[PDB]
Amino acid sequence: SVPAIFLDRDGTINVDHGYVHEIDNFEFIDGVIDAMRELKKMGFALVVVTNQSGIARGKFTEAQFETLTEWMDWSLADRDVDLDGIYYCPHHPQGSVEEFRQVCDCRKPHPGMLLSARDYLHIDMAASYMVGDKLEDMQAAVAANVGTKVLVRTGKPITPEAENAADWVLNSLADLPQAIKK
């Protein structure tokens, strides 16, 4: 088994601009690539787990998401961050794209994406971390038995509910390796 950092994308890796689907609108938050290289170095698996309901909404396609995601993956790999998994949920109950219109158990706060990563990569759950900007990220993490639940301030101007469900509140993912060391 391996401990992991589970990662939100929007608001945690990239700046949340609303339905980010183009390379030209993807902007890594300051210090997050270096922080991830350090988290790799300290021996964590890194696993993205992202809700992408813009797909169900018909904002962008699965093909556009894969194009953006291949790019993000290479762009991290080239900076010596090698991601262990990238999981995403394209669904929404009210989606207008029929393929993707459904209730599912991968859509955060449902824990399914973290569970699939857990079985695939054989993850030590209680030794693991979930980093996100939203309450659903905290709720997915509790359901999944993630040892430590970290809310960041680089996405959703946080809510009192999100803050209640979290263990740590950090300014950003860029602050996580020092918070883990101490």
By annotation, the residues acting in catalysis are: 8, 10
105 is in an annotated binding site: no
Please report where in the chains the tokens 């599912």 appear, as a residue. 104
- Give me the residue whose beta carbon is nearest to Zn ion: 104
Centroid of chain to Cα 147: 16
Q: Can you tell me whether residue 49 is helix, strand or coil?
A: strand
Q: How many angstroms separate the CA atoms of 151 and 100, rounded? A: 28
Q: What does 136 interact with, of Ca ion, Zn ion, none (CB < 5 to 8 A by kind)?
A: none
Q: What does 133 interact with, of Ca ion, Zn ion, none (CB < 5 to 8 A by kind)?
A: Ca ion
Closer by beta carbon to Ca ion, 33 or else 152: 152
Q: Is 133 in the site for Ca ion (CB under 5 A)?
A: yes
- What distance, in Å, lies between the first and last C-alpha atoms of the chain? 24
Q: Is 11 in the site for Ca ion (CB under 5 A)?
A: yes
Ramachandran class of 122: left when φ > 0, alpha when ψ lies in -120 to 50, beta otherwise: left
108 is in an annotated binding site: yes
Annotated binding site for Mg(2+): 8, 10, 133-134
Which residues bind to Ca ion, rule: CB under 5 A? 8, 10-11, 133
